[PDB]
Structures are given as structure tokens and as C-alpha cells.
Amino acid sequence: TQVLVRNGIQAVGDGLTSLIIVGKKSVLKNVTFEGKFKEVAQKFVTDGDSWNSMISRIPASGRHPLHYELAHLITVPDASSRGNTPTNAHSIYKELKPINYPEDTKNVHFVLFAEYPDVLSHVAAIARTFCKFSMKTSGIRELNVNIDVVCDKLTNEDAVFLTDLSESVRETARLIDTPANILTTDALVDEAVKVGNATGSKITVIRGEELLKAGFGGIYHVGKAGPTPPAFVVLSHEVPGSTEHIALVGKGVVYDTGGLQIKTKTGMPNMKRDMGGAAGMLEAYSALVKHGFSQTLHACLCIVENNVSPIANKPDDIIKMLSGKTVEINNTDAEGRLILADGVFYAKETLKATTIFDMATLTGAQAWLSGRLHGAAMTNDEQLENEIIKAGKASGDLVAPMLFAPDLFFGDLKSSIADMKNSNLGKMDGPPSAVAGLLIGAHIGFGEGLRWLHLDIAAPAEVGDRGTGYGPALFSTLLGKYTSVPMLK
Amino acid sequence: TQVLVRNGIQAVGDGLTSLIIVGKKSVLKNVTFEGKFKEVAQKFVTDGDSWNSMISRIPASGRHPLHYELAHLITVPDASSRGNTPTNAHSIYKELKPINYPEDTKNVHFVLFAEYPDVLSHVAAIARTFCKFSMKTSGIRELNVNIDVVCDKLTNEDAVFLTDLSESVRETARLIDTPANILTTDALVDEAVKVGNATGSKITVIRGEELLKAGFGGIYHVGKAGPTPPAFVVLSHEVPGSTEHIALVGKGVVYDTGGLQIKTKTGMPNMKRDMGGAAGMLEAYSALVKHGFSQTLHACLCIVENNVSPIANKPDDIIKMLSGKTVEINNTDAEGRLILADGVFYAKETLKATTIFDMATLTGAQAWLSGRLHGAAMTNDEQLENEIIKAGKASGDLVAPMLFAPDLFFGDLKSSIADMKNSNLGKMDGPPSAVAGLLIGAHIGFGEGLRWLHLDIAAPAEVGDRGTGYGPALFSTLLGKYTSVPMLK
Amino acid sequence: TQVLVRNGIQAVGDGLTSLIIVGKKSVLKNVTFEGKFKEVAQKFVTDGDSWNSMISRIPASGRHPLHYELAHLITVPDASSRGNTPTNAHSIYKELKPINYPEDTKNVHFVLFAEYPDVLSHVAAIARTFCKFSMKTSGIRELNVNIDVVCDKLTNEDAVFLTDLSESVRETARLIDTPANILTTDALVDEAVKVGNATGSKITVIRGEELLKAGFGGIYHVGKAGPTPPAFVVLSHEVPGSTEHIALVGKGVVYDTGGLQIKTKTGMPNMKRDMGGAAGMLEAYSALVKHGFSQTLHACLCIVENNVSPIANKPDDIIKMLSGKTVEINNTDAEGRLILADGVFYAKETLKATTIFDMATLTGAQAWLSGRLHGAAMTNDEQLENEIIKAGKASGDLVAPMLFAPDLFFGDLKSSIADMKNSNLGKMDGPPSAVAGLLIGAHIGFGEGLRWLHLDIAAPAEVGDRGTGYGPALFSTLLGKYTSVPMLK
Amino acid sequence: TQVLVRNGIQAVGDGLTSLIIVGKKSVLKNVTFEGKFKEVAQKFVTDGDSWNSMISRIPASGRHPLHYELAHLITVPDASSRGNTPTNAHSIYKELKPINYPEDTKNVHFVLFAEYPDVLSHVAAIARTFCKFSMKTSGIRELNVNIDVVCDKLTNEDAVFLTDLSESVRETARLIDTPANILTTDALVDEAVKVGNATGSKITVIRGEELLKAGFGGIYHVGKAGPTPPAFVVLSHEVPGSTEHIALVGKGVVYDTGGLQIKTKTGMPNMKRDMGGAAGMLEAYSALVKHGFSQTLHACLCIVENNVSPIANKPDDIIKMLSGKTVEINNTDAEGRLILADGVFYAKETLKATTIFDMATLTGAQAWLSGRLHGAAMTNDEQLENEIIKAGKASGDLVAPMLFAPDLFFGDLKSSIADMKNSNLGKMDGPPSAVAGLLIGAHIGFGEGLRWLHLDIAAPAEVGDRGTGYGPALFSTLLGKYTSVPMLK
Ligand code: NA
Ligand code: NA
Ligand code: NA
Ligand code: NA
Ligand code: NA
Ligand code: NA
Ligand code: NA
Ligand code: NA
Ligand code: NA
Ligand code: NA
Ligand code: NA
Ligand code: NA
């Protein structure tokens, strides 16, 4: 299935077409049934009077069929709470995701009526619903999707960006949805390298025993018992004399069994999704670099499978991290933070990054802090905390803040015989998701001298059985000021 | 044990004395061993040279004995993270709480060297360690405690307030520590009424069958299976023509067995502490009204015991709340929010309050959102959120924010046959502590037209086996601008 | 069913008879098939040659049928380990308990060939298998049982005692087997009072609110939520000028639901058996007093039902015990030790007992210390420990020692606000069964100045669905030197 | 850190010194502040009057600071219960273990005032607190420790022994504290062989496939799925014509995952400590052989890692042990007893040992039998049981007895298709720790014809996060009569 975003309603190809019209209630109320819109909608909506009659009847929000199988109107609510995004983009996903198209549909045409601040999140929300990945052996259909945005301020360049963003989102989700017997560590390295090639990036791959020799103790010891070897992948977009030097570090655990402290029967399904941070960072980097990204930018992907064998990490093991610090592993199901500790230290010490983001599906505890729609962000920089919250609202990739208090909470990871433990298995003073973040931060002085932000996306990275493709939209809006894209400025 | 706070070092009575000196490292470094301080300290510290030598040796923070049994120096750290209070008052508690005084000690003299912004939190932290409640049948000692604050800006009026604050804190903790076979609903009503009498308040007490008749369905049906009857207590401090009308609503569950959905063997000890919100609000109200509180203020205490009998609430029961809305009870261990729903509705509709705080020990989930030191605050008013966080830092009663999003999260409480359920027993989109708060808020339109703040203090209300007395310090600093107290302005 | 023990083989009444022959292998090898034995056995065993042939063939131990339905030989092993009784009496129970008698059997004749040191335990083991209690509404048969002991040293007076012992054993078991809807606290008081009347004892009964007024806080507060009231029953056998003053304190929890810390679905069946200590002490007292007991002896029965209501003990409650000491109840399923604390204090302070035994079915932990056949004894007196172990071997009511170390283990029950907790819900330094015993002992200074022995019989009090009647045999052999019975001297 | 024990107070080197004075209250009361003691203590204690004043004030027991950071007095209680050791040596550990020394301390000087029967346990208790093992990457300090014993009867030869005992204890603990990714089976073989070399022992190492070929089915099949191979190590100290032939068999499970019946998330941390028996036996053997051990003595170390792979033991597997008997493995987490069964059989049949001790960290059930301070000893020899209990009191390595009853309890291990099962997964008649011991004993006829003692030290081998170094002190005092050491005679 191909997805193209266009600036303005246009005709779609020949072939059975499904029409979905999307807009906030107040916007739809001001739409005139005339011109190109009439031409597209008249197949399903009789005339202007019947249009206005229907718009009057329909509630503040919802989904309404315009045909027995080929058409729908999605009404997005106007009102929103302060903790939500005023775009209400999740409402689009909620109403659209259940929609199926008849077997013989060739095209899906979306007519999106949106004010400029809503367009990006609305387009992303639609894109998320075209799930690339399936291994069904019948019924597979490829569709031609046109998302036609009706917005005065929108430019043709904005539409190119939105098409690229739609791809980045669908690619993140595809990588997440792919089972780990297919997306092995080797396969995810290959996916990253493909983006590396396409972006003209400087590519570094440190694999298997090379990780051990170079001192990546976290990445190596976590992944050493995988069926394919651990890897650290760096894609670098180096801009001589740039004022910023930004690293996007992603957790790429292609599967987590929990290790020797094994996950339960019901807790181990879905653990293919534990590479969602890596996938999100990779595809964010791709979307930004496609659009004239003016600063130095690195994607740093820590790629392992955490599995079970006589050579695996055992609780009690002490390893030496890239930082030179030692970690007592008391929890093999808390391994993601170990590989990220090496990734973030590399970003600081080797790449000389001064803004370091790490994004990961870490803890089930994250949903108890920020719920299922908001990523949980912990940062040493208050201004960056506010900026990423703002970016979450603008993108629809929602972000809520975590307490930053290493002085109060890092004691939860005290060890008698190593510099720290990787986890606390009992009662702790910090929120567990914060404590997980602090393990990572302990290896770069909790961000001292620079800006460090840790982002836990365990729950918002998925809805039901499907990856959401969280990450590209957030970082596009957060870092979009460094691109050529009008709507991101 | 009596606790007096004084403005300046003074002599203490005759009798064996234990000396504890407290200060931040940078403050202690500038203390001259001379004058009244020398007079007090020279019992234990030889001269000025030995003083300075010791201060040089001792680390950034800690506790150091000045005698084999009668004396200690507590060093408070200067540095603090952004998520912590810059007072670092919890460090005082941590170092002081373990200290025991010899059996024959008559006096405990504290010399507190503190800058003005630190004084209140530091004094509170010391007060917390003088636990009133004990039923030991030997070894009980009453001590005369003098907390002598050395601070230039401190006034004599400030010291009166700080003595009253110390009492409010120790009283909150006493009520929390008292077992529920002693502090029954009747006993807690009596305690509230005593404060009501002393404050010259207008006192309302609605009890037992009177609650049912008046339509308090939450308070009544939760508490109807207690060994003593449920009660709603209002203390009102009415100031004609005041611009603010503030209600402090407190959860006063004197014991929670969990109800018919009974708590576990290990989960039911400590449930005497489920009235910590009521105790904290009562003692905050007392401290404020003692100091010329210039606005209309109400304490609203919802006082029940949640126990097990054939007449208790059962999951599936539907009751009608004071609001007129119906609630399907699917969780009898989520009963605190029911009584608070009536309390907050009463505050809005009967008391005409325009600022409504509710404070409660609600969920174990709160610790997973904000950790064990920070209360979790959910409010419809962003400015109030910032103000209470600031008050948390100033008071040492730390506060962290919860997401406010009824649109995203209230759906977690959907019911097919009542207006809402009281809880969600599976997977929900909101943080569980937020969802608990939203149950309460649903009965006043989530604060619409006014300011509503819900504060979950489950974990910060206690450390180990002892109540902390959380609440009075927070509200003193938050609402202290309406008092006559110089340090609160 | 009636059970008579006779000194020598005699004829039994007319009516269908079942014959069971019992002996150690070495004893049976020396039995001549002649005389009264021939007369009894020749119904089933052809002649002396066929007897000797069979005895040659049969292994070291087991059960062998002598008829298709009416007759068996039980061979008891000669060898035994040092931790077992050399009587090997449990082997008799093991082989005999499964035996059923045809519906129309009128008599059961046992010929027991036993050396003098084996007789008591062997007779008790046989008696245990005649279970008094049944509420089956068909098939109930009353049998005439004659246990004919063949032992040179046995006297006619010994046979009277053994008949009384058989009754005491069967009575203990009957009381244990009776469901608690029948054997209520009132019913068990009545049973105790009946023994009191028959023994010519001085009877004291303190019940219901009288317990509270007299300060029995343990007995009262544990039992106050029962459907029938708590009671303390004392039967006293006072011998002016006796050198010993002995109290037998028994735990008579007629049913334990666990209280508010309720027992599990699978853990609550069998809790009618939690009065086995009371039943055992009552029936031991009866057997001793029937035979000219020369010392002052008291049975002290603490009789409660531990159930669930709004007035029940809650974890966190603090109560004042008869001793005047306070106990913080953190575990309502650890209630038996509370009532025993009052019983033992009463025995010391009111009865002036100088030897105090308490016997109780306390913890499931007891089986992890001493297994399922041995009671676990904790005592301040080493000589008494050895003596009761010796008595266990002689009686077949096996006893193993527990560590006695209040200095090392009593800290497991530390409380911040009462003199002690009743239990420790986590990790403790002592064996849990020892710690349970120490709760009781803490109220009499752990036996200081006297002899105190605590005996936990949780597992040996029952096999499968039936009470064993543990207790009477142990105390008969332990204290039998004070009776007129030749075999007990 | 080096530890030297000296006979008498002497000067310590130049460098910042920490002073700790240790004694029972009654001993300290008779200490004169004069001479060498005055010289050492005067830095911290003013004069003799101030000394005596302090000793008067201080309670029966405790720890009292003599300086703000450099000095402490530890008072040991005089009184002890019969189940405790009258040395009260655990009180020293309890008070001393929390003590930290300033970063720049060079020396720690201990002045131990102890009567002769207390010296060994007191010295050991101090030694235990100098934990060798740490992988912290900052803050590591090596100290010079002098334990100066003040005891009239003490000889210079006794002080050499006590220095060697301190080393044996600290070495046991070091081996225990070392994570299993470092102390592999190969590493522990190497450690054993080093002791072998130093002691001039005859050394046998049977490794990997050699174990299978030689018929060590227990050792081989348990360890075959380790990342490094299983091993059996024998160190032999052969004394021609000795009357005793003693084997010390130790369980050296370098890590236990539980095997295919895997341990839980919270139950698997600490399982590096499952080689505590091997470490204790090795270091006991070292201390004895260093001091002219006059009998034939063997250390037999069974060294495996129990891990998870397709070739691991599975429940249901039947293996053939060194004894020739078959064992049905129904519990892969009960593997330690399998390797010990081969060790003890080897000791009997190959080494011709007539006194066989096995020591192991076996079951969590051990703490429910004997608590956390006492090893649980099960032996066929009553005299040896009494002797080891006595040795436990004399050494401070406490020992409590387990029931010995193979006739009553071995039936818990009945199998239909092998000679026995290795465990019982349900209800059993024996204490589980006894039943575990009986598995081992079943392979040498439960000790028939010789003396066999099984010692379960699961809990006393550790306190908190640290190995105690249990074993060397016990066996020094038990077998010390065969050495040249005056204090052991
Ligand atoms: Na199809
Ligand atoms: Na994980
Ligand atoms: Na993971
Ligand atoms: Na006292
Ligand atoms: Na509750
Ligand atoms: Na509650
Ligand atoms: Na019948
Ligand atoms: Na119980
Ligand atoms: Na009980
Ligand atoms: Na350092
Ligand atoms: Na094991
Ligand atoms: Na093991």
C-alpha cells in the first residue's frame, strides 16, 4: 500500500474508491458542498442540503457511514483537556482503525479538513492505520492511498514532508509488528544500514565480539546469548560548524524473553515490540535528514536479542559498562537500560553530542506514571522538558514529564559490590520508570554539562496488536526548526 | 513531649540535655564558635579550633556524634536536583529519625542554623521525629524539646507559627499512628470537633442514618458496615466578604479492610493510616486559623470505617452519590474516592467553595507515578499546579504533577448501567492514580468553573512504621499569604 | 463402639468376630501356637506348622490377611532409628487404619503380643483407629472391642489405665473430628465441664464480657467476633502440700477462619482441628486424675472461635493482655498464641504453677521443623526437654526439640508502638514455630524462675481426615510417675 | 586489607588510625585505664575517670562512638540463652558490620578484651566484617588491621592460628561474594588447587567427560549444562597410621538457576552463594592443615553450575549415581543433594573415610527448622551431634540438630521406577531439610558402620548482601584437638 499526501483535493485514479472525510466539527460546519469537494463527495452525499442536514444531526464527535461499505465521515472533537493534545488526533485513530475496505477496493481517498496546527498529527494518525506488515496467505490487498489535505497555509513542500512522515510512521510500525524470528538483530542492523545508505550517512556497525573488545559491556553481555549477535549501529549526519550536536539513541531489543529471570506465560507475547525505540529513532532520523537538517545529528541503535542459555547474564553477575563503571545485574528483565547506558555514553564521549535523547520501551511501570498515550520524559533540562511536551501536543505523539531527582532516587540502585545495581526488586523511593532512566543516566553524570532526555514509550508505542509508529512525528515537531519544512517552523 | 520553637539560641532548663546541631555544610562552615553557641556547644566541642577542624573533615552531608550518647551534628547537603526541594529537609529526617536519647534525658536542644527559606521545612522535619503515639508499657519518656533557630530574618511571630506547625505535624502523625480500635470513626469525629471548638469554627456533624437521609450515598454506603457509624464533619471559618472560599476535603478512612473485595494478609497491615488525608487537612486548617486566616476556609472530613458484613457494599452494587449521579461499585477496595466524591460535591454545592482541595491516601499506584516523597497532584488549573509544586519545595512536603485529561481517561470508568464505575480492574488508558482522582472529579464536572485539586499522598504520608505528618507544612506555605505570619509572606 | 483393654487373652462375646493379631516380628517368632492363643486363632490359622510357616515367609513388617474378610496379622518392625520411637507404634496405625470390618461384625478382638515398654504406645495406636465421630446416615455400626495384651509384666491395674487411656485418646480425636457448627465454644466449655464434674475438680469458667472485665485481652479480643462467646475454663486438682504445681494450658480454637487476614480457599478446610491442644490437655488431665495423681494439676483451656465481623481484631490493633503488656496484632491468623499468652500468665500468676505446659496446633511451619509425627517442644529447661523427648518415645506421641533463644529471636517481634507484635510477616532470624512460642513466653519472662514448655502439635494431631488423639499418651508417660499405675512407674 | 591477630596490645604503624575497643560489659568494667591501653585509648578517652564514668552509663550492650568518626566502643552482652552461644559473638558482628572508616584511614586497631573461651569467636566475628570482595571503581581502600587480643591465657601460637582463621573466614566470604561470571566452575577448581598446593596436599581433579566415564552421575548430569564443565576436586592430607580418617565434602554450586524447573525472578538473585559449603570446607581444611593436623583429612569439593539448555536435566530424568543406585529427578532445583550423594559415596568407598561431613547451602526450608544463625545438623551419631553443637557454641558458628529418622522419612522419596526420587514436591512426613539430607545419606546406607553428618548452612552462610564465612571457625573448634594449637585443646 502506497500513501501520498497532497496539498488540496485532487482526483484519484480509476478503480473502486473508498472515501473517508475527516474534520473537527467546527471546521466541517463551515465546509461548502461545492467545487472539488462536491465532485468527490457527490457519489455518496446527495447535495448541499443533505450535507448540511447531516452535519447538523451528528454529535460532537464520531464516525458515520455515507454508504453501505465504501464511505465514512469521521468527526473529530473541538474541545480538549489541558493534558491532551488540542489536535485530538487520537480520536481519528480510534474511529479509523476499525474501518475495513471491501476486498476489491483499489483506492482510498481521504479528504482532510484541518487548520494548519492540526495537519501533521491528523495525517500521522491516518498513516498509522495502514499497517504494512501481514503474513496472511489470503486476502492481501495493496491500496493506493491519497490523503488530500484542505488547509490554506499548507505548501507543496509541506506535503512532501507529510508523505515522508507517513512513511517513517508506517516503517516504525512495520518494524515493530514483524516477528523476531524474521526481524533478528542481523535484520534490524540491515534495516538501519539501508536508511544509512539512503541518507548518505557515515555508517558505523560494531558487532558481536567487536563490542566486547571495544568495551561495550552492556550491549555485548545483554545480547551475547541471542541466536544472532548483538550490534551497535551509528548513522551520522555531520554538519561542519553546526551549533547543535544531537544524538537519538534507541533501544533495539529485537526480542526480550526476560533472560534467565524469564518472563511469564502471558507476559512474553508482544516482546517483539521491545525494539520500538530503535525503530522510532531510526525513522525520525530518516524524516529529518530528508529535509535539509541543518545540525549535526546521530542515530545510535543498540540492537540485541535477550535470550536464555548457559552463557546468558545471570542475576548477581557484575559487568563493566562502556563508561568504565560496574553494574551488578540483579534483574535480567531490566536489560534494556544496560544497552542504553552504553549508547548514551558513546554519544557523549565518542560522538561529542551535547543534546542526547534516548527512547525506549522500558517498563510496564511507565503506564502507571503517564498512562498509555503519553511517553514519559525524564530530563536534566527544564526548558527541554517543556519543549518536548509542546512537541508532543503539536505532533500527537504525547509526552508527559517524569520527576528528575538523582539525589532522591539513585539510592534505589545502591550496590555493596559494584558501582550500582541495574534495578531494585522491592520497594524504592522513586517511580520505577524514573529509576530505570537513572540507571542509564548514571553513566553520563545524569546529563551534567549537557542536555539529556530519557523517553519511555512502552505503552504509547502500541495499541492492541499493532505498533503505532510513535517517535517520527514527535521528533519532526521537536527538531523541525532545523529543517527546510515550512510547517515545522 | 513538648516542642517549642524559639527565635535564637537560648538556655534550656536544668536536667540532662541532649544537644543536636543542624545545618547545611556551607552554613556550618561560616558559624563562629563564640557567644551563645560556644556556651551551648562547649560541653561537647572543645574549642573553636577543634570545631573548625571537624567541620573541615566531615563530608558533604551526614550525621556525626559529638559524645558517646548525648550529642550529634547533622550536616545537610547544599546541592539539590530540580525535582527535590532545595531545602533538602528530608536529609534531616533521614539522619535524625534513628537517633535515640538516653533513658534519663530531660531535654533535647536543637540549634538549627538555617537561611530563611529553609527554616520552615527544617523545623517540620525535626518535629516529625518526636512521635507522640506509643502503647509501650515501659520506657516511656516525656522530653522538653527546644528548637532554637539561628536565622537573622526570623521573627518572634514566626517562632509562634513554627511551634504551632510542629504541633500540627505531630498531631497529624499521632492520629495516623493510633490503631483503629482506638481511633474509631467516633474518636476521629471527636478529634475534629476539638479542633473545631479551639478554632471557634462553625461545626457541622452529619452522622450514621442522617448521612443516608441527606443523600450522602458515598459516605453512608462505604461506612455503613463499620463497628461505629460513618460521619461527615465540616469546620467552617467564615470571613464575610472574603474574595476566596477554600475547602480542604480529607479522606478519613479510619481503617480499610478492603471491604468484601478484601485486602491480602500482607496488604492489610498499615490500613489504620488510610485517614492520613483527613488528619493532614484538619491540622493544616488548625495551623492556618491560629494565624489570622483572612479568607473563608472549610475543613470537610469524610470519616468511615470500611469493613466486612452482610450489609457491606458488594461489587456490582449501584449507589446514588450526593451529586445525584450513580456509581457502579466494581471494587470495594476503591472506596476512598467514593466518600471524597460526596465531600467535594458538598464543598461546591453547599459551601459554595471556589477553590476545592481534596487530599487522601488513595492508591498504591501513586508511588509508581510520583515515588514515595512526592504527593501526586491532579488539577484543572495549571497555575495552581505550579503554585502547589512551589509550595511543596518551600515546605518540604513535596508535590509532583499528575496528568489532567478527563477526555482521554474518564472512559476507563465507563459503565453500561450506571453513570460510571468507581474503578477499572484491568487495563486502562490513564495512570491509575489519575483515574482514581477522576472518579471524584466526575461529580463536580472535573472542576469546571472553579479550581479543583486532588492530592494523593499514600506513600509520602508515612516512612517505615510512622506517619510523617504530611499536609500542614504544604498548606501553610501554599495558603500562608492569607495569614499574619511574616515567613509565610 | 466400646474399647476394653484386658490383661491376657480371654474369650469375647457371642456374635461375628474379627480377629487382629499384632506383634513385633521377633516377638511373633517366639509365640507358641497353643493354649488360649490357639483357641482364638485356629478359626483362621490351621495349626502350629502353618502358623510357623507363615511367620517364616512374612517380611520384616506389614499386614497379612488370615481370612477373606474377618482376620489380619500386623507385623511391627523390630528395628528403629534414633529419631523414632523404638516401639514403632506408628507402624501399627499405618497398617490398621485402612482396615474395615464387615457390616455385621459385632466384635473386634485384638491379641497384642508386646514387651512391657511397648504396650502403652501399641494400645494407644490401636485405640486411635476406632474413630467415634460420624454423621453418616447409613452404615453406622457399634462394635465391642477387646484389646487383649499378652505381656508377663502387665497388671490388672495397668489394663484399667490402658482402657482409660484408650478413651482419652478416642475422646481427643472425637472432639477434633466434630465440625465447629456442632463443637462451638459453648459445646467445648460443656465438654470440659463434664470432665471437671467426673474428676471432682474445682471448676472455673470465665466467659464473654467477664473475660474483658477480668483483663483477659488475648482470649476476649480473639474470640469476641465468634457466633458464641469466648471462654477460659480451669479444672483444678489441688493436692495440699504437693511439691509440684503443674498447669496444662491448651489452645481451644474451635474454628479459625484466619480472622480479617482470612485463610485461603484451600487453607480453611480442616480448621475445626485448631482446638486439638485443648482437647489433648483436657483428656490427658482426665486420664491422670483417674489414677491417683499425687501433685497439684490444672487444665487451663482457652476457648474461642476466630471469625470475621466489623468488631473482629484487625491488623494494626493494639490490645492489652492479661499480663499487662501490650501486643500489636499484625496478623489475625496468628491468634492462637495470643489466647495462650493469657492462659500461661494466668497459670503463673493466679494458679501459682511452677511447671507450665502449653500445647497447641499453631503453625504450618511446625511441620518444616519437626515433620508430621513429632510435636515441636520449646522449653527454658534442658532437663525437661530431654524428659519430654523420652516420654514421646515411650508413649508413641513423638516429640522433637525447638531452639530456645529469646535473646536471638524475640527481636523478630519488635514493635515501635507496643511491647511486641504477635507475628513477623517477612524474614525473621528464628524458626517461625519458635517465634510463635516466644510470643506466648514473653508474657511470663520466657519461663524465668520456673519450668515452661511450649509444644506445637499442628501436624501430629492429625493424619488424613482424622484426629490422632495426640496428647494423653505423652502426658501419661511424662507425668505418670505421680500416679498409682505400675506401668507408668 | 590485611588482618593480623596479636597476643597483647601493641603499637600500630604511622598513618591515620581508627580505634575500636570490644569487650563484654563485665570484662570492660574491670579494665584499668593504664599502661598500653591508656596509651592507645587516650587519643579518644580523656582519663581514667571519664573512662569509668562512661562504662557506668552505657547499657548492658551496644555500640558507642568515642570520636566523631575515628573511634568506637562495642559492648558485648554477658547474658545468653541456652540456644545461643555464651560468647555472644554475633553481637560483635551486629554492632561492627555497619561501621565505616573515613576514606583516608590507614589503620584499624582493635583492642579485644576477652576471656579465653570467647577469643576465637570474637576474633572471627571481627574478621567477617573486612569484606575482601568489591568491584566498585572508586573508593577502594586497603587497610592495615591489627586485632590485639587482651587475654592472659592466649599464646603467640594461638595468635598465628587466629590470623590464619581470620584469613580462612575472609576467604570463604570472598569466594561467596564473587559473582558467578567470575567464579566459574573452572575458577573455583583453580582456587581449590591453590589451597591444595599451599597445603602440600595430594590433589585429584576429575573434570567434565571424565566424571561421566568414572560414573559420577550426580556431579556430571547436574553440571553438564554449565558454561564451564563440572568438576570433583579432592585435597588429601594423608597421615600414615592415623586413627581417624575424616572427609569434608562441600557443595560447590557456583550458580544455581534452578535448572529447567527455573527459580523465580526474586528467588534467583543471591544464587552465586550456593557454593558456600565448598568454600567453607576448603578454608576449614586450609586452617587445620596449617597447624599440624594429626589425622587423615580430605576436602572433597563437588563443583558445578546448574543452568538451562536442551541437554540439561529435566524432571522425570533418571540417572545412575556414583553409588550405582538410580535417582528419579523430579526437581531440578534440588540438584545440590545429587552432587553431594556422589561426594559422600566417594569419601566412603574410595577414600575409606570413617568420619564423613557434608556441608551445603541446601534448602530455604533450613531457616524454618533452625533459623538464620544456626546450621542444621543431621547425623547418625548422637555423640557427634552433641560434639558439633558444643563446637558451634565455642566457635560462634552455631549448630542446631535435625531429626535423624530414615525409617520414618525416607519414604518421602519413594519412586515407582528408580531407587528413589531426589525430592518430594508435595506433603511429606519429614522436615524438608531432613529429607534433603536423607537423599544424600541413602547412597551410603545413612552412615551405617561409620559416622556421617550432614550440615545445612543455607541461611547462616550469609547476612544481608555478604557471606559470613561460616565453616572454618566451626571445624577448627570441632577438629582442633588434632592440631598443635593450644586454644583448640
Ligand atoms: Na480472499
Ligand atoms: Na526487559
Ligand atoms: Na526490554
Ligand atoms: Na525502662
Ligand atoms: Na482502599
Ligand atoms: Na482506602
Ligand atoms: Na448399610
Ligand atoms: Na491461626
Ligand atoms: Na489457630
Ligand atoms: Na572516592
Ligand atoms: Na538448588
Ligand atoms: Na543449589
Side-chain angles (χ1 to χ4, degrees), chain C residues 103 138-141:
Chain C
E103 164 279 313
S138 69
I140 302 291
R141 296 299 181 265

Coordinates of all heavy atoms in Angstrom, one line a residue, chain C residues 103 138-141, ligand 7:
Chain C
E103 N -20.0 -55.3 57.6 CA -21.1 -54.6 58.2 C -21.7 -55.3 59.4 O -22.1 -54.6 60.4 CB -22.2 -54.5 57.0 CG -23.6 -54.1 57.4 CD -24.4 -55.4 57.9 OE1 -24.4 -56.4 57.2 OE2 -25.0 -55.2 58.9
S138 N -26.3 -43.7 57.0 CA -26.4 -45.2 56.9 C -25.1 -45.8 57.3 O -24.0 -45.2 57.2 CB -26.8 -45.6 55.5 OG -25.8 -45.3 54.6
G139 N -25.1 -47.1 57.6 CA -23.9 -47.9 57.8 C -23.2 -47.8 59.1 O -22.1 -48.4 59.3
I140 N -23.8 -47.1 60.0 CA -23.1 -46.9 61.4 C -23.2 -48.1 62.2 O -24.3 -48.7 62.4 CB -23.8 -45.7 62.2 CG1 -23.7 -44.4 61.4 CG2 -23.1 -45.6 63.6 CD1 -22.3 -43.8 61.3
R141 N -22.1 -48.6 62.6 CA -22.0 -49.9 63.4 C -21.3 -49.6 64.7 O -20.2 -48.9 64.7 CB -21.3 -51.0 62.6 CG -22.1 -51.4 61.3 CD -23.5 -51.9 61.7 NE -24.2 -52.4 60.5 CZ -25.0 -51.6 59.8 NH1 -25.3 -50.4 60.2 NH2 -25.6 -52.1 58.7
Ligands
NA7 NA -25.8 -50.1 55.2

